[PDB]
Design a protein around this ligand. Structure first.
Ligand SMILES: [Ca+2]
Lengths: 259, 259, 258
């Protein structure tokens, strides 16, 4: 409502925009509460197939945790606020639907952490990223130390976290931190395109694929293969799987319904 | 053998070719049966040091599961078929010898899964890859959800699996999915020359390296180091190690014998 | 003395392997002093970053000393091998980040030494490889473990099975080295990066190293719990307050490890 905007104008896709432009879309407690509420609702939306997360304006995706607010917090409040940010990251990652981060500007600290909590990332050429925490004598406390090395390797994650340096979208692409980079005015269009492609695939299968990958990658390969085996059981008794084969037989585009 | 070809022309190297060109080298249950039988034989071949896996023709490495055969299968049939494919992948992965995928054309779904079960991959410039399963309302059921993120990272694996999009050999190389790209007319000689190099190295050492890397990467670094330590004990008392030392001292090529 | 130790800039110690005639190879003597220096640095508050390099323009470290090994049976190979392994563990477990400045060839133990460092910066003319299988052995100081963790299983397998040596440029492509610079600029770029790290909160950098190094070894959920505990280590620090104050005042923070 106040700190976040939601857009359901695109069939099967929901667009969440951080809306605190004056504060560089930083994560305030109020914003986190609104975002948690929205994520709770989306979690139960069977008709929602893909989520896009972005920031309002052309300067910032998310500048991170709100420092004005952090500056006025005692130790107890700091702990509560960091807990609220961590929990929100978990809610984004555990959504049944794929979540696409559309990085429209600066994504620093908590902002990079937020993008890491998404399934994958698309950035504007003008975007900049970084985990700047060590420059302030703190560390990434919302998964930055964990999600970054998992995505891009320990070496790169270490140099980035130890230096706290800011990097360009192109550098981010080279390192594997962002999967796609596109001109600034084409960001929303490319995110919607990718989302619609995902939305055209079997919704039950896409959800099972997210679970299989996200959970299986956390363990040994042998166990991960067994999780994938159980996940696949989930598409066997679906009408969509039958439509896939029928469309193959009829030589046409399949049309899935999530059943 | 009617669905595959096995060639031992090159010393210490065996080349297995999927041989169903008319069917884009798709994986029928009959082909999977033959492949499992040859994999069982190679598993016990001490004279065989490296294996090359490829497809017949210049259009397809492997189009994946045979959908003509899959159509209309009842529940029990589907489970058995997916089981046959996943078991075959495990057998490729667990061969003592290194296995090189020579991707001569399209490698889709089960075809990309088959290439992921190999130690590393060489692709024709004209090859295309992808895990197209979600476009059929299913998920990769033969390790694609597990081996792909392990090789190229979770972010890229997710965008590929969720979209089910096809990518060029060039794109695959950029993402780290294939290790080499060469012209299709040179694919066979490139795979043979890399296989010959590996075959000239100490076979006990190469086999132990495969075991140490493949198993060690599944666990924590500390335990992984202890596994390497035990593996190293397997080479220090060998006659091949002594030949390596003498060859280096005499500045001549070593002639390893697997002892 | 087979190694030199000097403060290149405030808080940045440069350790140079100094056995140029023997390609900066790892002899027992060098290993002993390297272990001694690392034992000392573990207890230091002044040192915030370590740069590890080799003397000359030809070799970073050629690995295990060949002349010293020439006169070794299976039994002597173990103690030597054990000391190399142990040294690798001391580098990765050191509180401070360690940057490998690869000034030339890195082979066997030398490549393994670079992998035990937090990150690597290489001269344009440097090269790296694990040629062990060409000699019918395997990497015995973590190469089979640290390499796939950094660059993925597929490329680690290709390089280890073939035993091929690669250029700094190839290494950069694979993510084996994080930075590549012209030969004459290796020292100054390693120092520049170390200075940036040394200007950040020392408690925070140290906790970041532990959280990353340990957390990456387990499942994400547990790793996140480790990060949570590590964050508790910065919350009550004066440096954290200085960071917020220096940022507000828009001036350089003066951290004191408190
Ligand atoms: Ca693991």
């Amino acid at each position: 409502l106040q700190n976040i905007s939601v857009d359901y104008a695109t069939p099967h896709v929901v667009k969440i925009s951080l809306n605190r432009e004056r504060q560089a879309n930083s994560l305030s407690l109020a914003l986190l509460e609104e975002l948690q509420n929205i994520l709770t609702q989306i979690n139960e939306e069977a008709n929602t197939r893909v989520v896009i997360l972005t920031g309002a304006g052309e300067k910032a995706f998310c500048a991170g945790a709100d420092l004005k607010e952090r500056a006025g917090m005692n130790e107890e409040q700091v702990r509560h606020a960091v807990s609220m940010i961590r929990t929100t990251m978990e809610m984004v990652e555990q959504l049944p639907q794929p979540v696409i981060a559309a990085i429209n500007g600066i994504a620093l600290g908590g902002g990079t952490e937020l993008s890491l909590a998404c399934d994958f990332r698309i950035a504007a050429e003008s975007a900049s990223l970084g985990l700047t925490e060590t420059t302030l004598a703190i560390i990434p406390g919302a998964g930055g130390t964990q999600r970054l090395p998992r995505l891009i390797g320990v070496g790169r994650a270490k140099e980035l976290i130890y230096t706290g340096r800011r990097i360009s979208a192109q550098e981010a692409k080279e390192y594997g931190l962002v999967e796609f980079v596109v001109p600034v005015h084409l960001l929303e269009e490319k995110a919607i395109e990718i989302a619609e492609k995902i939305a055209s695939n079997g919704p039950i299968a896409v959800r099972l694929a997210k679970e299989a990958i996200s959970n299986g990658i956390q363990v040994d390969l042998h166990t991960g293969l067994q999780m994938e085996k159980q996940a696949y059981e989930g598409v066997i008794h679906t009408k969509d799987r039958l439509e896939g084969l029928q469309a193959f037989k009829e030589k046409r585009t399949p049309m899935y319904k999530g059943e």
